[PDB]
């Protein structure tokens, strides 16, 4: 056989490739089309590890499913991108991209060039951005009630909607506590310093955000106190054990007393470390590495409570919460490195496990959200919803601009684009107006998932949005009726909707540019 390319290299090209990509994309869309809005239904996903994922989150679903078509791969990747960037809109983006590709399929069948369609799409994207920024409204982030309404408008579409007030307060408290500024750089890191601990059992209504942190740990020695009412805390990266040296420190003994002298020297080293620690008069000592039993003895003699092997992330959160500074050489320990600010250290038994609380802190720049519920699956879903809520709160605190929900924004932008298209005289007006009408899929999907008449309601809504001051009009996802968002209260973050539109349009552009698939070749 005299081939030019290796066998298994199959090359497709042309309108078959284009239609295949578009069908794969809109199939990915149809997978999660029903998971949008407040009246969505749960899906039970089966992990490869025998696990289960019961969710409504578009990115969760697309992350748990596996595909082989590269267009579907790209759609899953843009869902992941949206989730990592804003943490919401993971299915709105998918649906918008699917609809944009669907409407572009039309122009592609009619001999229009993909580059023409793409340029039209980019024009339309710029004008979408302009219209969103025009219809947006500001927010007084000091209004806790306004923020709680934003968070309700973001979690109402999820399972925790039954405990909306609780989850909103939890998310708001967590983000406002994680808000931190140092050297003129504001930073809301709700991934390293807002921790969610899921303890199955109990009831969800007792879930709370702690003014401190929580770890799954016990005292190293049962003579140590488990309750301290104003603990001075020391954090260490180093082992309080006697470990070997970095070099070949081999010893050579010829005298009798030398062996015992060496063991006593080890003991004296441990004593000296523990004295370097006691000199700061702490109440609690927390290490990322081990603590030898002799060190425990000396600390207990000093009336100190020790926790042996904590994670580096938990130690960083304890630092941020109690106001301490992690050290690695107790000789280099300073009063500024000691942790004052914690109001209570408690070690209580939750079920049959011992959990260490460092709560009651003042000005804690880190937190632990203690979630309680019926099962690991319910609590995983609650945690995902709380991640959504906190990411929305963060997006707001960063960009205080709001836009109306319920598809009101989508209809306003579609109307603005249709109005702007009348000045266009070239051939791109048609794809431009097509993406405009492709934005209607969000209210369309809302109506479909509530169980109302899409034709009638979308017609009434497109008509309402042709009047002058009606760009806030949208739909209820709970009754199937048109309402004013100023009266309903469903307001999304401008950043969220901007990222949604941008990711959707760029995904459409990418998949339109794509042609001529090739495969088989091995890295």
């Amino acid at each position: 056989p005299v081939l030019v390319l290796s066998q298994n290299t199959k090359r497709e090209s042309g309108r078959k490739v284009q239609s295949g990509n578009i069908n794969a994309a809109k199939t990915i869309a149809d997978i999660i089309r029903t998971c949008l809005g407040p009246k969505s239904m749960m899906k039970m996903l089966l992990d490869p590890m025998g696990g289960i994922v019961m969710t409504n989150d578009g990115n969760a679903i697309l992350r748990e499913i596996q595909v082989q078509h590269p267009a579907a791969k790209s759609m899953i990747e843009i869902s992941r991108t949206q989730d990592e960037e804003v943490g919401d809109g993971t299915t709105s983006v998918i649906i918008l991209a699917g609809e944009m590709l669907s409407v572009a399929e039309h122009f592609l069948e009619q001999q229009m060039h993909p580059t023409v369609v793409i340029s039209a799409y980019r024009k339309a994207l710029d004008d979408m951005i302009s219209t969103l920024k025009k219809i947006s409204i500001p927010v007084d982030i000091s209004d806790s009630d306004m923020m709680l309404n934003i968070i309700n408008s973001s979690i109402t579409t999820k399972a925790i909607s039954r405990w909306s007030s609780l989850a909103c307060n939890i998310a708001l408290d967590a983000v406002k506590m994680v808000q931190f500024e140092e050297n003129g750089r504001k930073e809301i890191d709700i991934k390293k310093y807002a921790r969610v601990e899921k303890i199955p059992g109990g009831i969800i209504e007792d879930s709370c955000v702690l003014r401190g942190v929580m770890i799954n740990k016990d005292v190293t020695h049962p003579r140590m106190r488990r309750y301290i009412k104003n603990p001075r805390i020391v954090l260490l990266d180093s082992s309080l054990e006697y470990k070997k040296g970095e070099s070949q420190t081999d010893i050579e003994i010829t005298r009798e007393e030398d062996f015992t002298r060496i063991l006593q020297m080890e003991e004296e080293y441990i004593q000296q470390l523990c004295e370097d620690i006691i000199q700061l008069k702490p109440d609690v000592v927390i290490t990322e590495k081990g603590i030898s039993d002799l060190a425990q003895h000396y600390l207990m003699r000093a009336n100190i409570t020790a926790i042996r092997r904590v994670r580096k992330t938990d130690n960083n959160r304890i630092a941020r919460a109690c106001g301490a500074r992690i050290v690695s050489r107790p000789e280099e320990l300073r009063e500024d490195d000691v942790g004052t600010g914690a109001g209570l250290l408690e070690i209580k038994k939750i079920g049959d496990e011992y959990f260490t609380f460092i709560t009651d802190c003042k000005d804690p720049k880190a937190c632990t959200i203690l979630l309680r519920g019926a099962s690991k699956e319910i609590l995983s879903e609650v945690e995902r919803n709380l991640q959504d809520a906190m990411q929305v709160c963060r997006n707001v605190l960063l960009d205080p601009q709001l836009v109306p929900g319920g598809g009101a924004s989508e209809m306003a932008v579609a109307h603005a684009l249709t109005e702007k298209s009348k000045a266009m005289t070239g051939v791109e007006q048609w794809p431009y107006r097509a993406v405009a009408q492709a934005l209607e899929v969000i209210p369309r999907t809302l109506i479909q998932n509530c169980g109302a008449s899409t034709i009638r309601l979308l017609t009434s809504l497109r008509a309402k949005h042709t009047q002058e001051n009606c760009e806030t009009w949208g739909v209820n996802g709970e009754t199937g009726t048109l309402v004013d968002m100023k009266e309903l209260g469903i307001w999304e973050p401008l950043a969220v909707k901007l990222q949604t539109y941008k990711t959707a349009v760029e995904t459409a552009v990418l998949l339109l540019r794509i042609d001529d698939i090739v495969s088989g070749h091995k890295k």
């Binding site: 059992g201 040296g245 063991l263 039993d293 079920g351 879903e381």
Partner: protein, 529 residues
């Protein structure tokens, strides 16, 4: 379908399929576990793949041991596992109430009612039922008699009646012994040791400790009367230097000197122990028992035997605290400055050999805040069953103490909550009244199954009970010997308020989420390979 065009080897259950699958699996679990409920329930035998036998009536154990590979079954097993980890009881009732909620909801969903509306009714009924539970809970001073009734209500369901009458007093006394006023109960301070030699009704409460090991020196005494207990965490065996050392000598005499010297470090700790022993026991009147969490080499064992000390090695990190609470000394990680105040007292210490194993009893302590339950029985599976039962009973008594309230049993609260839900139903707006009715008919599964298991007609018995509760208002339940209604609070059949609340909450939550599942989908790698 959509998922199958992208992943061809994908399994999918949509809308109606999904609901049928989930409800079928839930009803299957309910069908298996219906027989566990109540003291008149039947014991199931469970045989591992190796051939090991388990005799159990416990819902969680039965769940985890059954051979099932269903997603809904996994969900419900997890809900039961959380119920068990937090409360210790209520797993069978949890599964039953989930299954019956799903069935009563399918009853209306098959007629085109939406599961969302059914779940709205579920949440309303859950709220009202929690309210009624808080209303009917009996806040009582937790005396030994009340705790005995509670532990009886649990142990009579979990084990045979005579063994339940034994475990009742054992468990109640154990908890009433390790319990300090206004101080959460640390159940870790109740050791649970199993011995496999005598009858199951020999299970007793040792007011002390029982270690699963004994002395390793033969010349060491096997019985000590007035014992000083030294709880230590200090190695008494040969310890090598952290940094690599090695010995270098030029003569056999020097080798002998180094051999004698290399042990001086541990000989010094042995000498400290021996000096404390001599200082506290000037004669052979009293005894001295060393209990080491770490090892003790033969040289140290010989040195201690010569002085008449009973040394146990490799004890448990929990036995350190248990010994410091039972005997009353101080557990040490160093012998730097050890004093007679570091010692505890045990009015008796002795050893018991059973085949190839040895046990050490530490009894006649003054007021031990830690005790042990000695699970005696003729079979490994009998011992496992009694372990599960005493776990249940300890959790039950602990919960009855923590929550000073206690709820009537025998399905009385379930009947009453059903009646209250049915009287509240009209106050619900729309077709969520049907979800409320379903919730009520689901709550009614406990008395129904109790009657079914005692061998009575479910409908006739339930009608009698509901009639008696409606005419009088008294909280009445099933009398498992006559099928008649009976007042659980008067006959001493009590349930845990915490357990009932956890049932309501978790069952409502999981049933709601299952009803709201509309697509089951396996479209991942399907393996980590």
């Amino acid at each position: 379908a959509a998922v199958k065009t992208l992943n061809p080897k994908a399994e999918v259950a949509r809308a109606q399929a999904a609901l049928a699958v989930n409800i079928s699996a839930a009803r299957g679990l309910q069908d298996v576990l219906r027989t566990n409920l109540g003291p008149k329930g039947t014991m199931k035998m469970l045989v591992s793949g190796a051939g090991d036998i388990k005799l159990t009536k416990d819902g969680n154990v039965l769940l985890h041991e059954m051979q099932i590979q269903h997603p809904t079954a996994s969900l419900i097993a997890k809900v039961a596992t959380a119920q068990d980890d937090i409360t210790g009881d209520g797993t069978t009732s949890n599964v039953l109430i989930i299954g019956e909620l799903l069935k009563q909801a399918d009853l209306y969903i098959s007629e085109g009612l939406h599961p969302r509306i059914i779940t709205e009714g579920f949440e309303a009924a859950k709220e009202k039922a929690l309210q009624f539970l808080e209303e009917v809970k009996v806040s009582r001073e937790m005396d030994r008699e009340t705790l005995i009734d509670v532990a009886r209500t649990s142990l009579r369901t979990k084990v045979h009646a005579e063994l339940a009458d034994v475990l009742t007093e054992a468990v109640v006394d154990s908890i009433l012994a390790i319990k300090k006023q206004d101080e959460p109960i640390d159940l870790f301070m109740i050791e649970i040791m199993e011995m496999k030699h005598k009858s199951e009704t020999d299970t007793s409460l040792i007011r002390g400790l029982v270690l699963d090991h004994g002395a390793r020196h033969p010349d060491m005494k096997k019985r000590v009367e007035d014992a000083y207990i030294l709880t230590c965490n200090v190695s008494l065996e040969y310890e090598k230097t952290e940094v690599n050392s090695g010995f270098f000598y030029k003569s056999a005499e020097e080798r002998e000197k180094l051999v004698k010297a290399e042990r001086k470090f541990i000989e010094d700790r042995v000498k400290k122990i021996i000096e404390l022993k001599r200082k506290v026991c000037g004669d052979s009147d009293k005894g001295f028992v060393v209990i080491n969490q770490k090892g003790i080499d033969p040289f140290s064992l010989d040195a201690l035997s010569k002085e008449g000390i009973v040394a146990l090695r490799r004890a448990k990190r929990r036995n350190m605290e248990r010994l410091t609470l039972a005997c009353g000394g101080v557990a040490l990680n160093s012998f730097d400055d050890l004093s007679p105040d570091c010692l505890g007292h045990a009015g008796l210490v002795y050893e018991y050999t059973l085949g190839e194993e040895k046990f050490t009893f530490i009894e006649k302590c003054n007021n031990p805040r830690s005790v042990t339950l000695l699970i005696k029985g003729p079979n490994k599976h009998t011992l496992t069953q009694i372990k599960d039962a005493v776990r249940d009973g300890l959790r039950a008594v602990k919960n009855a103490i923590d929550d000073g309230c206690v709820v009537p049993g025998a399905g009385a609260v379930e009947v009453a909550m059903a009646e209250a839900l049915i009287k509240h139903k009209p106050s619900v707006k729309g077709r969520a009244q049907l979800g409320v009715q379903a919730f009520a008919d689901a709550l009614l599964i406990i008395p129904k199954v109790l009657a079914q298991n005692s061998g009575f007609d479910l409908q006739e018995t339930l009608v009698k009970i509901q009639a008696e509760h409606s005419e009088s208002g008294q909280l009445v339940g099933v009398d498992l010997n006559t099928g008649e209604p009976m007042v659980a609070a008067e006959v001493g059949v009590w349930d845990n308020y915490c357990v009932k609340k956890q049932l309501l909450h978790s069952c409502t939550v999981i049933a709601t989420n299952i009803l709201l599942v509309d697509e089951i989908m396996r479209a991942g790698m399907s393996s980590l390979k």
